[PDB]
Amino acid sequence: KLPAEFITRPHPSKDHGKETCTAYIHPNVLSSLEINPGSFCTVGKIGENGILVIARAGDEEVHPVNVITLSTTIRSVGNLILGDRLELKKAQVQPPYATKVTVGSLQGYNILECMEEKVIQKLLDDSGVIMPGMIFQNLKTKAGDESIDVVITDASNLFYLSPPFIFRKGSTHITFSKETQANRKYNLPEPLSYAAVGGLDKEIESLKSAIEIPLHQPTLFSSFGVSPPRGILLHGPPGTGKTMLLRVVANTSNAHVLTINGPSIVSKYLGETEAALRDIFNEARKYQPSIIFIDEIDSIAPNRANDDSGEVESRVVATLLTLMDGMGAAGKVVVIAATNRPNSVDPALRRPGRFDQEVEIGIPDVDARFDILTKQFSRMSSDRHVLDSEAIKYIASKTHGYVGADLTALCRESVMKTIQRGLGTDANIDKFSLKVTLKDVESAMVDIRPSAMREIFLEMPKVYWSDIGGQEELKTKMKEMIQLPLEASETFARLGISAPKGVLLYGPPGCSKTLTAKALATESGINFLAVKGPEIFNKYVGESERAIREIFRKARSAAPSIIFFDEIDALSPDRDGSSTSAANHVLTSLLNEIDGVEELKGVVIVAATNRPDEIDAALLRPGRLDRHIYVGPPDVNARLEILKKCTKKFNTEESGVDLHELADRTEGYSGAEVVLLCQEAGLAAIMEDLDVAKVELRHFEKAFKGIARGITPEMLSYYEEFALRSG
Amino acid sequence: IFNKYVGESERAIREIFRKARSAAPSIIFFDEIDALSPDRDGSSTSAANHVLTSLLNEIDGVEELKGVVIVAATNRPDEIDAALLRPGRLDRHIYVGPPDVNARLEILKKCTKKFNTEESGVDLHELADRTEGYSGAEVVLLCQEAGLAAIMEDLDVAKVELRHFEKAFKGIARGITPEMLSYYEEFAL
Ligand SMILES: Nc1ncnc2c1ncn2[C@@H]1O[C@H](COP(=O)(O)OP(=O)(O)OP(O)(O)=S)[C@@H](O)[C@H]1O
Ligand SMILES: Nc1ncnc2c1ncn2[C@@H]1O[C@H](COP(=O)(O)OP(=O)(O)OP(O)(O)=S)[C@@H](O)[C@H]1O
Secondary structure, eight states, X not given: OOOSSEEEEEOSOOSOOGGGGEEEEOHHHHHHTTOOTTOEEEEOBTTSOBEEEEEEEOXXXXXXXXXXXXXXXXXXXXXXXXXXXXXXXXXXXOXXXXXXXXXXXXXXXXXXXXXXXXXXXXXXXXXXXXXXXXXXXXXXXXXXXXXXXXXXXXXXXXXXXXXXXXXOTTTSEEXXXXXXXXXXXXXXXXXXXXXXXXXXXXXXXXXXXXHHHHHHOHHHHHTTTSOOOOEEEEEOSTTSSXXXXXXXXXXXXXXXXXXXXXXXXXXXXTTHHHXXXXXXXXXXXXXXXXXXXXXXXXXXXBOSSSTTOOHHHHHHXXXXXHHHXXXXXXXXXXXXXXXXXXXXXXXXXXXXXXXXXXXXXXOOOHXXXXXXXXXXXGGGGGGOOOOOHHHHHHHHHHOTTOOSHHHHHHHHHHHHHHHHHHHTTOTTOOGGGOOOOHHHHHHHHHHOOXXXXXXXXXXXXXXXXXXXXXXXXXXXXXXXXXXXXXXXXXXXXXXXXXXXXXXXXXXXXXXXXXXXXXHHHHHSOSOOEEEOTTTTOOSSTTHHHHHHHHHHHHHHHSSSOEEEEETGGGTSOOSSOTTOHHHHHHHHHHHHHHHHHHTTOOOXXXXXXXXXXXXXXXXXXXXXXXXXXXXXXXXXXXXXXXXXXXXXXXXXXXXXXXXXXXXXXXXXXXXXXXXXXXXXHHHHHHHHOTTOOOOOHHHHHHHHTTOOOOOOHHHHXXXXXXXXXXX | OOOSSTTHHHHXXXXXXXXXXXXXXXXXXXXXXXXXXXXXXXXOOSSOOHHHHHXXXXXXXXXXXXXXXXXXXXXXXXXXXXXXXXTTSSOOOOOOOOOOHHHHHHHHHHHTTTSOHHHHTOXXXXXXXXXXXXXXXXXXXXXXXXXXXXXXXXXXXXXXXXXXXXHHHTTOOOOOTTTSSSSSTTTTO
């Protein structure tokens, strides 16, 4: 008999003896493959390149058939975390002598700082089979150094992960350096650490405590008269760093790790999926300091009140409950789960005694994004060129909605942009030499829209504020809501007020409401969602309200956002209430959501309507849409600006068409009519001659004689009465 | 409480009362009760007034002084089906009208707390009377708008001043007197 994939454990000694590069193994494993004690053999994770080590027979009286025990030196090379499955194999080739080698420290010093070379020689002779990555730590210190470590940083591949060598004193030119990593050109795996996670400092502290105490100080807790926590539940929106924390916990917690990532346990055969959970938990008890990760727990522990849950899933939930309760004697196993939708987990698993402890991973704020970007950019400091922390703080300020995955994508796209630009100067430029100037991160932001916004497909032609002629008070009041609350948060805080977060734009048809919406989308800088009501309505009961909840949820997933309710009056029910069963629920849901964002959040709601007084008073009160602005017909200057914007590509100067006279003639026009006048003039010019160069006053006369004034005294009176409905 | 599938709304209401049985004394709060009984009883009585049926059944089962009481709110009083206002059900009514001069001044004092109104000479007793007919939230809004007027003038503000309150006042509009002070005076009768 010969197991397929053996389990890693430590060889109990950590004195850095002669064994530091041996692999204690059960006799049958060596013999069945005809390996012998002292012979070299390969160890590696399933499907990866191998790691060379020295085989050695263990104590069959105690040592199980399935266990291969390695050294902290060997495990450093491949980042073998206690409990991963190894695909051991025999080896047939002897590596040469390490002609050139270097040794350093993970903590950044030179080994020339504390200890003489003799103990270094002895230690690296105990290694024997030299290769990069053999960290070893906790030696004696010649000085009173608070800590120490040593690492073989480089040396000079038969499906091997590291390039192995053999020690031969003197011939192997061993130098010494400040280096902490191993040579990247080898691409040995690198362990993650809590120093890479940024922004989540407090969550990290809580999780570190909750994992430190149960595994490594259980006896202490029990004296306080309560049983220890035994389940932790990480949750939050996708892309915030849960799985990263799970892998960092695996690397940093010196405990045996078992994983159930998704439905990796389900089986064809009727009973065997339960056997999988029971086996995992039994093996976690075998090596009592251990952690079991259940990532994407909702995929295997569904709610069962959601009747979509199958029999397999109910049987899995029942077994997992009886196991979690059955972690008897208050041992040292800790079960950490991660889920982006914790409410889909069966409540039986969140009861006290089950996953009672929960850590919420929130969306980064500006400071959190600054921390994440500083950490991510500190990994590339020699190629950075955005070295100013001011520049990184600018990028953090501009990246509204980025969640932590999006920031890493931003850095990746910045690398790509820098390569594109550099390679644009020479087809064979040294691509490794290019460095990431801020301009390239700014260019990358154009492509990397937040992942929370990928369900918002909108064409959105590009329109700037300068295109919206002569609405200056509207522009100022939109600044006040879109930019000032973000650039002046501290002044609001000290004054003790929240900025208004709703505005209603009303006015005659043609005046720039939707144009202001497009301008906000183009130049607000923050995320933009639009609901073209009555787009939300749906046949089935509850679907119309679920649409409002979903759009407000995505606006809440975007962090700073702008929900533009075009024709909001379509959602406000009718006066007579005739068959408005669905509409009433729609308006109540909309009000409940505007009240949900009313507290603690900074979403801004913009609404545009042509019938200002047919929308419910509950939806116009402050807290709901606060500000009302009358987007009225352009005055003389506004029409002059529109005429310039339109006729700029006409040769007006030589043509002699004086735009001021047009502005005088066009009194009463809406902006749409002023634009149509220019379009009609251009059509007249083109129809007169297909090779037009100039549009001249006869064409504008022709266009003018055909354009009506859609605005009437009645409409203007109505919109100037809406401001006075109170009396 | 409303779901696409058949009968899931009824189950939800009965389950809400079931869970409500858990304690006493206890207030059940039906905000915007007018959107629980909007129609299908007075009109459009086709097949889907079950939610009203269930709620109006439950409202009777609760004992008169066992410990549970029920509070509701509405700004559309006549949209509430008369079935709910039958005595024994919900017949008691309290009017929450626009604040009087002294109430508005208390709101102003609270929401202008960190404004140095004393140093700037912003005499609240002028704002409290100028803001007559301002219904609650609008008194609060007038103070947010004053602050924004202050910040836009010179970011890094120390205090807000009367001219900012003038700018705020000139931009706020009130409610409808043929709908407010009416349709509630009538509902009082
Ligand atoms: N501070 C950080 N927060 C989050 N992600 C970070 C951070 N720093 C770097 N990252 C990277 O962002 C990604 C985070 O991993 P994810 O798997 O996206 O975490 P998660 O998406 O929140 O968990 P899921 O969606 O349930 S698998 C990885 O590619 C990390 O390298
Ligand atoms: N300064 C401006 N003021 C008004 N309209 C302008 C201005 N500049 C351009 N336009 C034109 O305005 C048109 C669109 O105006 P909209 O904002 O969509 O009007 P509207 O408010 O949506 O009217 P409704 O929705 O029917 S009540 C486009 O054809 C623009 O070319």
